[PDB]
Each structure stands twice: as structure tokens, then as C-alpha cells.
Design an enzyme around this catalytic site. Structure first.
Site, PDB file in Angstrom:
ATOM      1  CG  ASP A  39     -14.395 -13.763   1.698  1.00 60.58           C
ATOM      2  OD1 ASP A  39     -14.570 -12.549   1.956  1.00 60.58           O
ATOM      3  OD2 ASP A  39     -14.802 -14.295   0.648  1.00 60.58           O
ATOM      4  CB  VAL A  40     -13.664  -9.380   5.427  1.00 62.36           C
ATOM      5  CG1 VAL A  40     -13.816  -8.805   4.025  1.00 62.36           C
ATOM      6  CG2 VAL A  40     -14.221  -8.408   6.461  1.00 62.36           C
ATOM      7  N   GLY A  82      -7.862  -7.071   6.183  1.00 61.81           N
ATOM      8  CA  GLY A  82      -7.067  -7.099   4.971  1.00 61.81           C
ATOM      9  C   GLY A  82      -5.625  -6.706   5.264  1.00 61.81           C
ATOM     10  CB  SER A  93      -0.991  -0.032   1.160  1.00 64.86           C
ATOM     11  OG  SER A  93      -0.338  -0.230   2.404  1.00 64.86           O
ATOM     12  CD  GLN A 149      -1.852 -11.643   2.830  1.00 64.78           C
ATOM     13  OE1 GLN A 149      -3.038 -11.751   3.152  1.00 64.78           O
ATOM     14  NE2 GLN A 149      -1.434 -10.682   2.020  1.00 64.78           N
ATOM     15  CB  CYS A 180       6.453  -1.014 -10.009  1.00 65.18           C
ATOM     16  SG  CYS A 180       6.240  -2.230  -8.684  1.00 65.18           S
ATOM     17  CG  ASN A 231      -8.254 -13.305   1.390  1.00 68.07           C
ATOM     18  OD1 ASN A 231      -7.082 -12.938   1.514  1.00 68.07           O
ATOM     19  ND2 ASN A 231      -8.959 -13.032   0.305  1.00 68.07           N
TER      20      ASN A 231
END
Ligand SMILES: C[S@@+](CC[C@H](N)C(=O)[O-])C[C@H]1O[C@@H](n2cnc3c(N)ncnc32)[C@H](O)[C@@H]1O
Ligand SMILES: COc1ccc(C[C@@H]2c3cc(O)c(OC)cc3CCN2C)cc1O
Length: 336
Positions: free
Chosen positions: A165-166, A115, A77, A143, A311, A139
Site C-alpha cells: 500500500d503506497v 499503482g 486506464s 498483479q 463500460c 497493493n
């Protein structure tokens, strides 16, 4: 001169950087022409049409490759760059502190990061606020594993990670603070998302959302026309929405805005630029890392070409007009 033509040449490192940048800049310039309307009357009509349309709606990169591409905490981010000599690692942290200031994090609070990625913000809060209980939600199995491993090395006892999964996850639990960073861009149904969040809050809770935006208008991340080879390359699905800076103002069925900011897109541009430069620097190591899991040097080059083009593209997008087109929006909300 056509779809496949440009893609063929791209995968074969036959498009130089200056040309690639110029091609992508053009593509985004056409997005601008599509989005800006001649009167505010018409601009609102357009924006509201988009908002109204919203209210009707397995492979994972090795963490080792991630460490070779991103900053130390693998923030995925926009970061915040104080100085012209700020490294990606410093920008990561600056960004983390900013969120903490803006979300009004205090020692002792329960914090939920939806997330949460590779967990750089989960880890930051937990280390800085020894009395916060910090939950990451993700999810991705990989991670959750990476965050837990980092919490262990850093001797952090105040971290848990929910694998969910939110959009499916259900719980009675509420939280003093909910943070949503670069995640709403992926949400299929925002009105229903915002509704769910409200149920995980009390009268005392605050919600902080950060998302890529355009200052003026919303758009799906997809091809306008036939000449746009970029959008579909980067997001092969295209379930990335780019809300306007003010879109979330319209989603106050269940939450109420308290504050609202944007961050100039040069910060994002410097973020992607650092990722790119660092990827280039570590080009060989990266190829070696990826080869096992991909089992083909072409498959690796494919995975690398895509991350690099992202990028390179991101740089043209967020730097446009000195970062005054695409940028990052932030909002603070309480429950109804
Ligand atoms: C662009 S990354 C942002 C990562 C991290 N918040 C950061 O700031 O670096 C988006 C995150 O949302 C997660 N995500 C996407 N869809 C999700 C879903 N339906 N439920 C939970 N997490 C999801 C992704 O796996 C990833 O962790
Ligand atoms: C659909 O899942 C996903 C697909 C792509 C992504 C890309 C994501 C990402 C997305 C952006 O729009 C961005 O600003 C330029 C920066 C970054 C950092 C890299 N990071 C990994 C995330 C997902 O969670």
C-alpha cells in the site's frame, strides 16, 4: 422509477442498451448542472472549497477473465486512439508511448510506476529501454504475480515489483522517474501522497501523473440525488475522486509543475467501448472462467453486469459533448 426497481430490472437484462445509455447520460447531465456555476467568481469559490476539503482528509478478478475483456497488456486506464480503425491493442501502445514522451523517459533511468496494475507500462518501458531499471508498485498480490510472469516470458531482466500500500510504504530509495497513472483517483489524502512522492525523488527526478478529470470542476464519484442508481453501483465505496483538470496545480507544496496537458475524453470513451465490445464477443468464455471462483451463475452474471454497466456508463461520461466534459489530465512535476 426507483432505486431497487431499476436495479432489479438491470440485473435481469430487462433494460435495453439504448435505454441504459439514455438513463446514465441523464445522470451525468445532472452532475454537470451541479458543477457549473454562473460566474467564474462562483466557480472558483466552489473549486477552492473542494480543494480545501481535500486537505483535511479481497477478491480479485481472474487474469484470464481480464484477458478476455481488456487489451493485450490489460491496461486499466484511458488509451489513445489515432485512427477510427485503431484497435484497443494499438491504443494501449499509443498511450504507453505518449506517457514515455511526456514523462521524458530516457534509457538508463530508474523508473517507478505507482499503482502499476497488470503492468503494461512497466513492461513497455522495460522492453524499450533495456538500460532502465523499472519498478512497479501495487497493493495486489495477483498483479505482482502477473507482471513477474510476463517479464519472464518476454525475457526481461530489468523489472522488479513492490507489493505495498503506497500510503503505508516506506523507503529511502529515490528514482529518476515516477509515474502515476489512474491511481490518484483512489488516494484518500493527496497532499500527503504528493509529499511522500517528493521523498522518493531527487533534484533530477520527474513526476508524471495521469488522472480522469472534468475540465472545470471536481467531484466525488457518488450519488448526487436519489435517482442516481449508477454511481453507487459502480463504486460501492465511492473512494474515487474526480479532480478538475487543474486541481493538482493546488498541490504544489512539495512538487513544482513543469507542464500540463489534457487528452480529449473521446479516447477514454473508445477505450471503454472496446472493452465492452470485446467482453460481449467473449461473453460465454468469460462466464466459464468466472464460475469456479464465484461458484454460482448468478454471481457471475452479477460480476459481468457490473463491468458492462461501468463500460456503458464510462462511454456516456467521457463522450459527453464530444469528449469535452470528462477527459484525462496529465501533469509533469519536479521536486521543490
Ligand atoms: C485504475 S488502476 C490503474 C492500473 C495501471 N496503472 C493502468 O494504468 O492500467 C489503479 C491501480 O492502483 C492500485 N492501487 C490502489 N490503491 C493503492 C494503494 N493504496 N497502494 C498501491 N496501489 C494501489 C490498484 O491496485 C491498481 O493497480
Ligand atoms: C478501488 O479499486 C478500483 C476500483 C475500480 C477500478 C476500475 C478501473 C478503471 C477506473 C476508471 O475510472 C476508468 O475510467 C473510466 C477505467 C478503469 C479501467 C478498469 N479499472 C479496473 C480500479 C480500481 O483500482
Amino acid at each position: 422509477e426507483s432505486i431497487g426497481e431499476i436495479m432489479g430490472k438491470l440485473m435481469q437484462g430487462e433494460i435495453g442498451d439504448e435505454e441504459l445509455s439514455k438513463r446514465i447520460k441523464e445522470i451525468f447531465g445532472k452532475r454537470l448542472q451541479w458543477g457549473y456555476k454562473p460566474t467564474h467568481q462562483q466557480q472558483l469559490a466552489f473549486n477552492l472549497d473542494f480543494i480545501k476539503s481535500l486537505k483535511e482528509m479481497t477478491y480479485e478478478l481472474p487474469s484470464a477473465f481480464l484477458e478476455a475483456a481488456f487489451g493485450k497488456t490489460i491496461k486499466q486506464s484511458g488509451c489513445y486512439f489515432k485512427d477510427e480503425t485503431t484497435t484497443i491493442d494499438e491504443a494501449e501502445e499509443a498511450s504507453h508511448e505518449l506517457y514515455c514522451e511526456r514523462a521524458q523517459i530516457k534509457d538508463g533511468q530508474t523508473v517507478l510506476d505507482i499503482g502499476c496494475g497488470q503492468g503494461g507500462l512497466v513492461l513497455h518501458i522495460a522492453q524499450k529501454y533495456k538500460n532502465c531499471h523499472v519498478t512497479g508498485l501495487t497493493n495486489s498480490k495477483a498483479q505482482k504475480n502477473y507482471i513477474l510472469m510476463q517479464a519472464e516470458k518476454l525475457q526481461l531482466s530489468n523489472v522488479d515489483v513492490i507489493l505495498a500500500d503506497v500510503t503505508k510504504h516506506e523507503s529511502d530509495k529515490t528514482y529518476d522517474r515516477i509515474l502515476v497513472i489512474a491511481t490518484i483517483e483512489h488516494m484518500k489524502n493527496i497532499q500527503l501522497f504528493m509529499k511522500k512522492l517528493s521523498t522518493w525523488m531527487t533534484e533530477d527526478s520527474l513526476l508524471f501523473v495521469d488522472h480522469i478529470c472534468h475540465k472545470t470542476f471536481s467531484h466525488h464519484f457518488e450519488a448526487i440525488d436519489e435517482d442516481d442508481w449508477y454511481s453507487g453501483f459502480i463504486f460501492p465505496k465511492g473512494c474515487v475522486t474526480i479532480l478538475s483538470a487543474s486541481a493538482l496545480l493546488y498541490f504544489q507544496d512539495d512538487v513544482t509543475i513543469l507542464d500540463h496537458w489534457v487528452v480529449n475524453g473521446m479516447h477514454m470513451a473508445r477505450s471503454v467501448d472496446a472493452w465492452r465490445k470485446k467482453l460481449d464477443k467473449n461473453m460465454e468464455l468469460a462466464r466459464e472462467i468466472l464460475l469456479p471462483g464465484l461458484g454460482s451463475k448468478e454471481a457471475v452474471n452479477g460480476v459481468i453486469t457490473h463491468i458492462r454497466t461501468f463500460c456503458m456508463g464510462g462511454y456516456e461520461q467521457f463522450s459527453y459533448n464530444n469528449g469535452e466534459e470528462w477527459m484525462v489530465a496529465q501533469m509533469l512535476f519536479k521536486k521543490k
